Symmetry: C5
Subunit: 212 residues, 5 copies
Amino acid sequence: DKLHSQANLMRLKSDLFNRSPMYPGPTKDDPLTVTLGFTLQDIVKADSSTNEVDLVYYEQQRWKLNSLMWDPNEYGNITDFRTSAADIWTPDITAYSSTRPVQVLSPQIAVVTHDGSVMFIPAQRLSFMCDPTGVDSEEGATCAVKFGSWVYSGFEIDLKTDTDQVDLSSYYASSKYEILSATQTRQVQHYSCCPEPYIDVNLVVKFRERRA
Amino acid sequence: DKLHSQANLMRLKSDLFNRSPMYPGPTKDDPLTVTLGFTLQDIVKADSSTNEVDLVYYEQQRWKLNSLMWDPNEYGNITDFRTSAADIWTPDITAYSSTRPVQVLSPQIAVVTHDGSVMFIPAQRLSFMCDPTGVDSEEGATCAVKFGSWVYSGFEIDLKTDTDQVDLSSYYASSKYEILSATQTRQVQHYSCCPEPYIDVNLVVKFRERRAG
Amino acid sequence: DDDKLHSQANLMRLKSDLFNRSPMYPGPTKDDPLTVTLGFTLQDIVKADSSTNEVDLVYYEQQRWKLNSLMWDPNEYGNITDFRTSAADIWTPDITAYSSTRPVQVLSPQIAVVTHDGSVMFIPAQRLSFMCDPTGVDSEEGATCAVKFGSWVYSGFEIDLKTDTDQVDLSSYYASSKYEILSATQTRQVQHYSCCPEPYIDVNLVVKFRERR
Amino acid sequence: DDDKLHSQANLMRLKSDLFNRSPMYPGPTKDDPLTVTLGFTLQDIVKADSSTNEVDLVYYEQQRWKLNSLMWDPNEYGNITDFRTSAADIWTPDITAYSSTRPVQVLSPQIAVVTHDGSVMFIPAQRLSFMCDPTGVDSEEGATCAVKFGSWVYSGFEIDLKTDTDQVDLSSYYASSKYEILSATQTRQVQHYSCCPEPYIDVNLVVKFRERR
Amino acid sequence: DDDKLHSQANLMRLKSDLFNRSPMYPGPTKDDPLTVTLGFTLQDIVKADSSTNEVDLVYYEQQRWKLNSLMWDPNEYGNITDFRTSAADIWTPDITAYSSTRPVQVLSPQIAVVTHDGSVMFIPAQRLSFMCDPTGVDSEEGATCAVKFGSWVYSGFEIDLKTDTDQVDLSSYYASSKYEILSATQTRQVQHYSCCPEPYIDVNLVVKFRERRAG
Ligand SMILES: CN1[C@@H]2CC[C@H]1C[C@@H](OC(=O)c1c[nH]c3ccccc13)C2
Ligand SMILES: CN1[C@@H]2CC[C@H]1C[C@@H](OC(=O)c1c[nH]c3ccccc13)C2
Ligand SMILES: CN1[C@@H]2CC[C@H]1C[C@@H](OC(=O)c1c[nH]c3ccccc13)C2
Ligand SMILES: CN1[C@@H]2CC[C@H]1C[C@@H](OC(=O)c1c[nH]c3ccccc13)C2
Ligand SMILES: CN1[C@@H]2CC[C@H]1C[C@@H](OC(=O)c1c[nH]c3ccccc13)C2
């Protein structure tokens, strides 16, 4: 009974991975749109001696590849499966103003659905460039960090959000810092280096030292 | 004789691991219950500048797979064996409010028994979100951290505990912090992101600074 | 959708032909020397530690070189003119900070852009602690420090370096840094060491900076 | 020159026969138990942190055991009596500090010595933080602490431990340490846990130390 | 174009001939012993912590040895006399600090230079924390500390060591370090241990240093 479902799932993964060579990533002729979102859990530290702030959050990443679709009826009605992020292509979404390598807090496992879509939710701790002047005031401090592909232009990787409101409903209630507001907004960057635009989602956080 | 038992173990492992492929993990039609329990060894530090607390504890993980069963009589009466956690599938049990990657303090080796049960006991150090206010009072401070699958819903991984009492019999007797109470409780919740419930075990610790008499 | 499928097979075939149908490039020799263009984009001076004389910089290191072994005719691969690939898939130059005090910490994906003429562009973002006395940083005149970059093991007969400009790119310098940049230059130098009879090449990064006020 | 060629050939053949022809030792069993000889050489107490009750030791661990599967006749292999090999080529015991607070940091190469009677010698140098209250370190009496080392997953029925002496080797203890050693002993102990019907064996390192005067 | 193509081919063939056509060198033995020439270049004393008696040093080690198994005739390979290769491609000696307090942090690419006579030059740069009491560092006489380097697992019957000079290279020492070096020596020694029937060889690096002053 369960033997058959296990066999079917193995067969599906072999047909998708071991049979077909890995996705070479997007191109101008085969571009990809990645949906990004942020769930802020904690501002751990705001360092005014170096202007770095440490955030704990997760990143919702979603995209769709035709090379990952399958007919459930042809695979025991399996409609999704979990797999190691190392078995699939994942986008190179990067903070543009980190000061330390990102520290990964969640399992590098993703969910693949029969329509070819992938959902990958990396939890992480990030130190980024942030002047916390005003954090000890009622108006608070405002910092910002952009997330995008490091190496793919908007012709290969476009980004989008499902909303411009950051999810603060999991934010730690006894953090040293309360969040006043947090937005997440698509932007188009034209850097002086590079003819091709680079797309990003800009996370803007207004925050202050917790005071009743 | 011992040469034989050694060959029997090598055979069993070859049969279990190298014959059928890796267990692809649970599915809604083949769901798995993971039994979780905690053994708290030390509250190492409570940082009020950041509201992070560092715990040293073990996490008892137990589950059972049909694909790991064998007949002991077909293998020289071997009833269990130890093996690298890399040789088997393991659940993606994750602290939901960690602030640093968890640091593993013990060997990544599991015990597999002939009924297909796996016992895995990783010791580790965790920093998590905790406001230690009141730690210097008679009432002490209270913090909590949930643990569960990151990627699997309750329809794929369920959790349970064998007791609601955290195991304190190995708690370091000269810690800077004394434990007032430690409980572990199964919870079910919905997140706005997904239509399925997710299961966690919530570790709640009440603690205060040790004082001399 | 077949056209998207075709474009993918073209890319998969090109990489297969460049990488898997030949052994990696063995690096440069006296007979086939390489020129690496180096350029720096200063993002932030994060920290200036006067107790240890170390300064920490966040910057991109632009690296560019060209190999005949990476050339292809786009017309034979459906007009594919460039592609992105893991820096592990190709040879990369061993460009090293000569006065680092800690291992460089990499902040961006290790992915390069390869073009049909055989040119490679690799732009790693990095945090570097290097040797620097920040005395004067809290004055109008400010502090001056310098760090040299070059091959560790190739002399100027095998790896030559150049810059496209002597001016460090400051267009991405963090506007609310603790430190403002008075000037930042990048200059090719040639050195002889006592060890070795051949000259080594480096690019010297000189940065003048002061506490923002 | 030719003879060195023969010697190298003989060693490569031995290693190939021991490692590539037969599978790796699956570890000890109830029917084929193993005794590991364990001893400690304490080099330094680096740090004692009274705010977290963690002490940091630098030491080496002497580990020795013997496997029939690693035996060979020297006459079959050009009179070779022993060799050095990566610890990855062989099974090693999962000897673990029961009260560490951070992952152990390895200071020496992961290479072991294998002798023709199947005995193995492995001497990992390490830095360990462990649970220790340094109260009294600033007195003439000093402070005492203890840390036990044993297998994480094998009971006394699979791995037994022994010591050649109960005296910790202090002959390489750093003479200018912040802490002088008053005593250091290593004692086999048998412990029962409520979790487990089988006892586990450990070597308990007890150190008495004080601030150098 | 065609001259460069050819030289690349010769090098590719040489490396294949050295690495794939025989298994990787099993290291030295009593019958096939090796001498490593060792030397130190000190770049910076970054930190001297008197709360724990640890000093942090950035330096590089010059390591040289020679193997018959890495020899070739340049005339057979387009007159190639040397090449650069990943240190993972070759055996390297397990030269270890005897009194480190933290793992070494590597600051240079792990690549060595191989020459047709079978000699290997490997120059690992690193930051080392080692056991060192800095008392007297705030005085004219300074502080003196020492750290030995040698093989961890091979005795003198398998790995011998030599220096080219007793004078540590201080020419590249960081001129604006918090600490000035008064002197640095590097001396071969023989150590006998109770564990083992034969002695182990080390180079003892002795450094006299003090807080930088003026005038
Ligand atoms: C997301 N991106 C990061 C920064 C901009 C965009 C693309 C990559 O940067 C570049 O290509 C260059 C930067 N500076 C340069 C100078 C000469 C050539 C290229 C670049 C990585
Ligand atoms: C234990 N889990 C963590 C958080 C909830 C549950 C499942 C995983 O989260 C998601 O799938 C999403 C979170 N936020 C989202 C937003 C849009 C789509 C998916 C998600 C990882
Ligand atoms: C950029 N480089 C670093 C330092 C100089 C140049 C080449 C490499 O060093 C050497 O080969 C030697 C240094 N000191 C030595 C002493 C004896 C033999 C060789 C060397 C690495
Ligand atoms: C050295 N060892 C460490 C601790 C005891 C011995 C064996 C391992 O622990 C267990 O199996 C359990 C601990 N607590 C438990 C609770 C339920 C089931 C098993 C255990 C790891
Ligand atoms: C450089 N070396 C370090 C220390 C001496 C030499 C060889 C290695 O040590 C041993 O084998 C033992 C030390 N102490 C012991 C006690 C019983 C058995 C072996 C050893 C590592």
